[PDB]
Design a protein around this nucleic acid. Structure first.
Ligand SMILES: Nc1ncnc2c1ncn2[C@@H]1O[C@H](COP(=O)(O)OP(=O)(O)OP(=O)(O)O)[C@@H](O)[C@H]1O
Ligand SMILES: Nc1ncnc2c1ncn2[C@@H]1O[C@H](COP(=O)(O)OP(=O)(O)OP(=O)(O)O)[C@@H](O)[C@H]1O
Ligand SMILES: [Mn+2]
Ligand SMILES: [Mn+2]
Ligand SMILES: [Mn+2]
Ligand SMILES: [Mn+2]
Ligand SMILES: [Zn+2]
Ligand SMILES: [Zn+2]
Lengths: 348, 356
DNA sequence: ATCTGTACATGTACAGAT
DNA sequence: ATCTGTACATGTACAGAT
DNA sequence: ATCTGTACATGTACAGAT
DNA sequence: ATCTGTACATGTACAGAT
């Protein structure tokens, strides 16, 4: 009953959705026109909306949108970077850029920046570049703050890379036929934009499966009718919203959690949805225990420092390399607290 | 257990499948290629395998294959034929390799099927690989049937079909009621696929005889047959087996055995049983209502449902609700009471016709 | 020289065979 | 149990055409 | 090629019923 | 308290026109 009340808070408002979407769509369509309405290196880029807002798991406000500008590029050879699973060198218009992610991202970025300068009807700027982000991030005020991540992606139509061969383990949940079809779709690569000082960092790209995650989010039941008008409701998305909320509220309070992101929560719940495939295990009457066993799953990842990429199982998002052991223990204490106290942080 | 053994008798042998498919694909692919020659009016037709063999509900032997030779026709107007829901006049909007089959803008089924058949016939006359001839034309059939003596006899229906990519006709708006079974996203995607028209070709003498076309949903039925569960994993390697197709096979076989003996049953065809079980699958959506352990009672309820259709003279087309395949104008009560009595007798006596 | 309809190439669910 | 032939979806090569 | 038109999925919002 | 039915809204796939 508590959680019902929290989920009412987190719910987006129809007016808010309409006002933010109409302004976001204005800007994106404009950047999009430019990318081909010019002999630029990215003519033929197409738009693909991704992330929480388009998955309908955005919470609180419609203030963050993700758009992929995917560029179909033929006959490319991947090279796995030092067995990371998820990072690759790319080889063979674009010959102004081995295809360097740094080089291509910044011309891409230069074009956006120029169009934003010529937008006089919307208050929009380009956020200062962040290392680690494959994005160009727009900041819009109308007057509400909305940020848009414009993600550059290459699109390849061959077999998925070998490191994914054992990924996407939906066989007992969404099944083999959905899995085969999903793997017939293209796969995508985005810039790994670290500044860490390590080796081929500048030319590395990372795999993206945002398009596969979108289908899963909107086709998430074992029954075809799950969450449809002639089916039952499940509380799978509500659990994702609640667990996202918990991590958001925690990161607001604690700088020690800067190394965590929503994608960790998302990865965790894909694993939970695979471990517990039956729609009846996510009955809306069992929201509380569903949320709890999610919390317990998330804590078990922290405890064992193990949260494998749902699509690239050798890639540990919780390795010591990326997140310090101290950071995970901090987060375990705070979650264990919120859990055993009826979630005080949910009341603010 | 008794029905388990009938299924084994009905099971196709991989060796038979291999030999029959090898011949069949040879002929079909050669026919499909002639269609692509010359100023052949049918240039651009594409192949669509449909029917029981490609749904894996073909029984006893692999001796009848159905293939659609479909031709996309854009900018099509339809006129429903006398509110029957399923039959249409095809008209065009301009003044086209189908020119030779036009009347008053009206596209002739009987004309265009004749040319299609003449081309097949000629192409077959050439085949000296295989003992293959073209059957005498059957009234009411949209097909050009090949009889292959492969030693073993093998029928192939080459079905001529127009392909329109627009929305399906209003007469189907209330059809295909899979919302509580396969759901709304599947229904929306299925109805985004093309719809098809095949020649009615009746020769009954009624007005418009040779220009009426009949809707076809073979392509939708193939999808349904192979994605038949409320659960995405139904019959998959990491899911539970159902007995949905097993019930279809047993019903098909009961109608086949009877049809083989008694010619009173000539108005009946396997599409009747196919349509009846789509309704049963809708009525009983859950995969647990089709547990392999309960094959006996699933087959029983399908028989009881079919019996009620026969008595009440009512079996609605699954895609065209207002079209009644068991109407008095199509099959007389006397033919349905005869089949009713034969089904009750097989039911209540241990299905002795399964032993013949 | 480049273009492109045809057909090989690849991968796997389905279900028969062992 | 695993092995395995057919059908089928989609990616790609290239002889013959422009 | 680009773009509008169409259908209906996913939502939110609220009154009346249970 | 929740459930149901209608209204209101945005996103998305694709046919078809220009
Ligand atoms: N580390 C990552 N690895 C792979 N994909 C990622 C990663 N981070 C984000 N993504 C992809 O980009 C999408 C957008 O990420 P983002 O940070 O905006 O969060 P989100 O899932 O959209 O939700 P929210 O913005 O509400 O926190 C993700 O849904 C996922 O598809
Ligand atoms: N009377 C009909 N009305 C509508 N569609 C029909 C009709 N008869 C056949 N069809 C369609 O054509 C297909 C082929 O028909 P056919 O009579 O060969 O039977 P089948 O369903 O393939 O099975 P079997 O040949 O094993 O008896 C059917 O699956 C169905 O889609
Ligand atoms: Mn987001
Ligand atoms: Mn983002
Ligand atoms: Mn058949
Ligand atoms: Mn047939
Ligand atoms: Zn659901
Ligand atoms: Zn099944």
């Amino acid at each position: 009953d508590k959680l019902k009340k929290v989920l009412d808070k987190l719910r987006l408002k129809r007016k808010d959705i309409s006002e933010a979407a109409e302004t976001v769509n204005k800007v994106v369509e404009r950047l999009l026109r430019r990318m081909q309405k010019r002999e630029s290196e990215f003519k033929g880029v197409e738009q693909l909306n991704t992330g929480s807002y388009y998955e309908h798991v955005k919470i609180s406000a419609p203030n963050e949108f993700d758009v992929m500008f995917k560029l179909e590029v033929p006959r490319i050879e991947l090279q796995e970077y030092y067995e990371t699973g998820a990072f690759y060198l790319v080889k063979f218009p674009l010959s102004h850029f081995v295809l360097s992610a740094t080089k291509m991202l910044s011309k891409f970025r230069k074009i956006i920046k120029e169009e934003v300068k010529e937008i006089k009807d919307i208050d929009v700027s380009v956020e200062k570049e962040k290392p680690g982000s494959p994005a160009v991030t727009l900041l819009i005020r109308n007057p509400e703050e909305i940020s848009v991540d414009i993600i550059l992606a290459l699109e390849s139509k061959g077999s998925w890379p070998i490191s994914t061969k054992e990924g996407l383990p939906i066989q007992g949940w969404l099944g083999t036929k959905v899995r085969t079809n999903l793997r017939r779709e293209p796969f995508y690569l985005v810039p790994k934009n670290a500044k860490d000082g390590n080796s081929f960092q500048g030319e590395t790209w990372r795999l993206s499966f945002s398009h596969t995650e979108k289908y899963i989010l909107n086709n998430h039941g074992i029954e075809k009718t799950c969450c449809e008008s002639s089916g039952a409701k499940c509380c799978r998305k509500e659990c994702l919203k609640l667990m996202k909320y918990l991590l958001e509220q925690l990161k607001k309070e604690f700088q020690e959690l800067d190394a965590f992101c929503s994608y960790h929560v998302k990865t965790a719940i894909f694993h939970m949805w695979t471990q517990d495939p039956q729609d009846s295990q996510w009955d809306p009457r069992n929201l509380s225990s569903c949320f709890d066993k999610l919390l317990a799953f998330f804590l078990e990842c922290l405890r064992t420092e193990k949260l494998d990429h749902y699509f690239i199982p050798k890639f540990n998002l919780f390795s010591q390399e990326l997140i310090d052991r101290k950071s995970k223990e901090f987060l375990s204490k705070k979650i264990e607290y919120e859990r055993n106290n009826g979630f005080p942080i949910f009341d603010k």
